[PDB]
Design a protein around this ligand. Sequence first.
Ligand code: 36J
Ligand code: 36J
Lengths: 264, 264
Amino acid sequence: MRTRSTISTPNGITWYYEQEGTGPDVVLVPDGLGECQMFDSSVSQIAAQGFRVTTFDMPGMSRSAKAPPETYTEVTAQKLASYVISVLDALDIKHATVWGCASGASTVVALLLGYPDRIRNAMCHELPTKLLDHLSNTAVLEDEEISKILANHMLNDVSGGSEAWQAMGDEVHARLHKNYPVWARGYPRTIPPSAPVKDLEALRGKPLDWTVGAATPTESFFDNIVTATKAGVNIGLLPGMHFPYVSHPDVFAKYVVETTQKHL
Amino acid sequence: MRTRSTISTPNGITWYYEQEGTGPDVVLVPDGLGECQMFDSSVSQIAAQGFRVTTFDMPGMSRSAKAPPETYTEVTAQKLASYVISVLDALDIKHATVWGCASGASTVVALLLGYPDRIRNAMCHELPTKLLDHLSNTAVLEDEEISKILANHMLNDVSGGSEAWQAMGDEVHARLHKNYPVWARGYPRTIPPSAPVKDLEALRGKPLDWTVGAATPTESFFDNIVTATKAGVNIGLLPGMHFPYVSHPDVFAKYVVETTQKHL
Ligand SMILES: C[C@H]1CCC[C@H](O)CCC/C=C/c2cc(O)cc(O)c2C(=O)O1
Ligand SMILES: C[C@H]1CCC[C@H](O)CCC/C=C/c2cc(O)cc(O)c2C(=O)O1
């Protein structure tokens, strides 16, 4: 039975969060769009292996929109990490396994490095480390132009699974619609240079498991593969592209549980 | 002005070859389809920077089809490397820069390792190290079935540039048509295990420059990126996929000249 509720933290954020299961804590941090419905099936599937799974909409996104501006403008990994630590503090999650893609991947690595006592192990997927001008240039467009362009880009280029993307439903896509402008203005310029992945050695020997999408063009996260290999960090593939939890929920869920079981 | 001619070597092969330019030798070794007209523009463009450029159809392929069966069945990097050393012997090329993609990539690294006195530097692109059952399954079909399927697969999936691929013309596509079966039967089972990349320390400090296609799915050559990084070998991207010399001739040519100038 899934808890669907709100909890507030003293940095001014009111988080929408979901929680199911009993057992060691596993936390699913969204990608930049900040929408935790993307995890819905995997929440249940990972919980059914004996885990308490918690996820949430990210600050300023979807149903966690009640948040002050610093929390969704000039966003950095280090900022997100501290927001995530504060919602963990509120929910009394002391020791967590954490997953994150994209800005969520940067967040989890910054969590692992900054709060090692708190993080049992971290799985990061497709960690952005490069400025991408086609994304960054949308910031200066009109809100509805941004939503049209980014919605299309997710649907056609990066979903990894067009049908599964569209099957999330109208409600989700209506929340994403409003998030695309806030993401565009707040994330693409400032997340990449915040990447906590330039000190290779600090990554060495850490409980970190890195993935890239199998179908993602080799150029997008070529640099993740080099960096992981130079740091001896485990690196592999998940099917699909930027949203394996949408396109391949069953393999995603099994990967989270199997990687979590390694570190208990 | 380009030389277009044949030369026979004592392993029973009659090679079709082309050559243009004066200067240090640069040799362009085809991919598995063995068809050197794919290089035509780049031959002129690299020569025009002060190089003597040589290429050729590969044994059993295209206009180098007069060759004994061992030269195009159970093909191996080590076999292809000896075949190319013989055509270089015949043509009196003592020192060469070499390029190769796919089976050509395996050939060039085997050349570099096996004949270090002969190879100034090698550029390998998308070196196949894994058995691929969808490719190997085509071996047991009808010849004309194999040509249909592979001609379509190159056109639509892996050219990196559909217009540029088709613009090579009817003559080249008529030669490829006959090569697809010979390749299917001779290459995909035996070329991957022959990959000369399993000894990391032999690669280290060698004049080797490795590339993968930018648009190629991450999974196809993930392993090349890990291997290069573990051996300190330079590794980067070219635009397109499996045939940058077809899809992006100008940037391919400039990459060959620049990388050759580094080592000269
Ligand atoms: C939401 C998702 C966008 C996917 C399409 C993007 O085109 C995928 C490109 C990879 C980088 C995305 C990205 C970059 C960035 O600077 C900050 C981010 O939060 C992301 C990110 O979260 O990626
Ligand atoms: C002809 C070229 C493109 C084949 C499409 C392939 O589907 C592209 C995937 C990479 C594999 C290429 C390949 C594998 C191999 O074991 C031996 C080979 O000679 C090649 C190779 O030459 O591939």
